[PDB]
Each structure stands twice: as structure tokens, then as C-alpha cells.
């Protein structure tokens, strides 16, 4: 409390409480994230203060005082999870889905160009403002604290956006994990339903398999040597994306298919995705936000 006034608890985050607060020196309203419990994490997270881009939530300070860690972020009034829930009866308009996907890809491309991954993208960490912007929150952290099974208040961390290589026990991550998550989020904006709402690691994995087909060495060379791969996994046929994400058009379905390739090496990059014909007519609409 020495340095700011803690307006409200915003919510209960993956790593600790989130507060809306006012900076006592500047008067600015900020999101304050308390990280509950290490020197290696402090240097790593501090480097993120320089990873600045218009589609990345600004990390204003990394305050390590009284043997506690607080992250101070730019405050945004809405997240995509709440926006999608409030949009359920009508859907998010396609031009706005396109705008948001384009902006999210720009944020990914920037971070990936600096060799920073997110690793835990989900609608709750995509924040929106009144000006039609969307921004990625919590980039580079997943590399600092890990991703727990449960939060500090025993909430289950979602599996729905987790890439198949992670589920199959690969101990190494690439930029492709974030493209996978974003493809899942794209599909959910279009259909008004989570694409793969698994409630366990095997349910997650089998939901992926039932839509995309059980992977094999043809589509994913090396998959059968993955730590958690089992030869006994059921063999499901692949579904047409025309059945999975109607009424998305052929350009959108083509882009989505490239974001959801099994082999992380085949999955489209953020930079190549920006050049996709789906974005030829992209615009930046003003969303209907109630605050």
C-alpha cells in the first residue's frame, strides 16, 4: 500500500490476486498482480519491461519489495472471455473477429521476433479497450513461474488452448504453441463455442483427435516417439473444417487449418499469417463495450 491505492480486487489470477489500483505519484489507474511464492524469475520478468508493442499489455513495473513480487500493468476494462460471453446471443461481428485476430497476430509476431513466447494464451488474457484494440496480457511469464494444474485458490487452469505437443509431453516449446492457442480462440469467436473444451489431459487430447484425426507419422513425423504417445490411442478420422467452423469463409478456414497443423514445424508463423488473404479486407471497427 506504500506506493498505490488498491481500488478493488479485479479478480483471482493464475499466480495471485489482481487489483485495480491508483499510482500515488502519478494518479494513473493500473492493474496490480501479486505473485505468490527466486532471483532467476526476477531478472527474466524484468526484461519484459522492454518488450513494448501496441498489442501487448504494457508492463509498467516489476516491484520486488518486502520480499514480495508485484507486477504493475496498464489497465484495460474488458477481456475477450467476458466479451464473448456477453456476445453469445448474436456473436462477435466477423469484421471485428478479423480485426482482433489481425492485431493478436501482430502482437505474437513482435514477441516471437524477440524470442519470447506466451505458452498460456486464453481468452481471459486477451484484453480489449473502447478504441477497437486488443492486447495480449501475461507474455513471457509462463517461462518464469511455469503453468500450474491449479491456481493459488484451487481453480483449475484451463487445458482448452494447449497445443498437442505439450499434451504429448514434449519438454521443449516453440513459437508454434501460441499459434495453436490463437487458432483455437479464432474458432471459438466464430462458432460461439470452445473448439476443444477438455476436462483432463486425455479428454483434451482425444477431443483434438476426434476433430483433426489421430495424428500419425505421415502428418507429424516424430509423433510416435513423443513421451506420452501411446500406440493404443484410438484411431479417429479427420473432420472437414466446413463442419467445424461454419459460417467461416474459405479464406478463414484455410488460415485456421494452417494454425492447427499437428506438426509444430508445419504450423503457420504469426508473420506469414499476417500476409494471408483472409486479411486483405481487414478494418478496425469500434466494438460495443458497456463498462
From Swiss-Prot:
The active site is at residue 120. The modification Phosphotyrosine is found at residues 15, 19. It catalyses: L-seryl-[protein] + ATP = O-phospho-L-seryl-[protein] + ADP + H(+); L-threonyl-[protein] + ATP = O-phospho-L-threonyl-[protein] + ADP + H(+). GO terms for molecular function: ATP binding; cyclin binding; cyclin-dependent protein kinase activity; cyclin-dependent protein serine/threonine kinase activity; magnesium ion binding; protein domain specific binding; protein serine kinase activity; protein serine/threonine kinase activity. Phosphorylated at Thr-153 by CDK7 in a CAK complex. Phosphorylation at Thr-153 promotes kinase activity, whereas phosphorylation at Tyr-15 by WEE1 reduces slightly kinase activity. Phosphorylated on Thr-14 and Tyr-15 during S and G2 phases before being dephosphorylated by CDC25A. Pfam families: Pkinase. Serine/threonine-protein kinase involved in the control of the cell cycle; essential for meiosis, but dispensable for mitosis. Phosphorylates CABLES1, CTNNB1, CDK2AP2, ERCC6, NBN, USP37, p53/TP53, NPM1, CDK7, RB1, BRCA2, MYC, NPAT, EZH2. Triggers duplication of centrosomes and DNA. This is Cyclin-dependent kinase 2. It comes from Homo sapiens (Human). The gene is CDK2.
Amino acid at each position: 500500500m506504500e506506493n498505490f491505492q488498491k481500488v478493488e480486487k479485479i479478480g483471482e489470477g493464475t499466480y495471485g490476486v489482481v487489483y485495480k489500483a491508483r499510482n500515488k505519484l502519478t494518479g494513473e489507474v493500473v492493474a496490480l498482480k501479486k505473485i505468490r511464492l527466486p532471483s532467476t524469475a526476477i531478472r527474466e520478468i524484468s526484461l519484459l519491461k522492454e518488450l513494448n508493442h501496441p498489442n501487448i499489455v504494457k508492463l509498467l513495473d516489476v516491484i520486488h519489495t518486502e520480499n514480495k513480487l508485484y507486477l504493475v500493468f496498464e489497465f484495460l476494462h474488458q477481456d475477450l472471455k467476458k466479451f464473448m460471453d456477453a456476445s453469445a446471443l448474436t456473436g462477435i461481428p466477423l469484421p471485428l473477429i478479423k480485426s482482433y485476430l489481425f492485431q493478436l497476430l501482430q502482437g505474437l509476431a513482435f514477441c516471437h521476433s524477440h524470442r519470447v513466447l506466451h505458452r498460456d494464451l486464453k481468452p481471459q488474457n486477451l484484453l480489449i479497450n473502447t478504441e477497437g484494440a486488443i492486447k495480449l496480457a501475461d507474455f513471457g511469464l509462463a517461462r518464469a513461474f511455469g503453468v500450474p494444474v491449479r491456481t493459488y485458490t484451487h481453480e483449475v487452469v484451463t487445458l482448452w488452448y494447449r497445443a498437442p505437443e505439450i499434451l504429448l509431453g514434449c519438454k521443449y516449446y516453440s513459437t508454434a504453441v501460441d499459434i495453436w492457442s490463437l487458432g483455437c480462440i479464432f474458432a471459438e469467436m466464430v462458432t460461439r463455442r470452445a473448439l476443444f473444451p477438455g476436462d483432463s489431459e486425455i479428454d483434451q487430447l482425444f477431443r483434438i483427435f476426434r476433430t483433426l484425426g489421430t495424428p500419425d507419422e505421415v502428418v507429424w513425423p516424430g509423433v510416435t516417439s513423443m513421451p506420452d504417445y501411446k500406440p493404443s490411442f484410438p484411431k479417429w478420422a479427420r473432420q472437414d473444417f466446413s463442419k467445424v467452423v461454419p459460417p467461416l469463409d474459405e479464406d478463414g478456414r484455410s488460415l485456421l487449418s494452417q494454425m492447427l497443423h499437428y506438426d509444430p514445424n508445419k504450423r503457420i508463423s504469426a508473420k506469414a499469417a499476417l500476409a494471408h488473404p483472409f486479411f486483405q479486407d481487414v478494418t478496425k471497427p469500434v466494438p460495443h463495450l458497456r463498462l
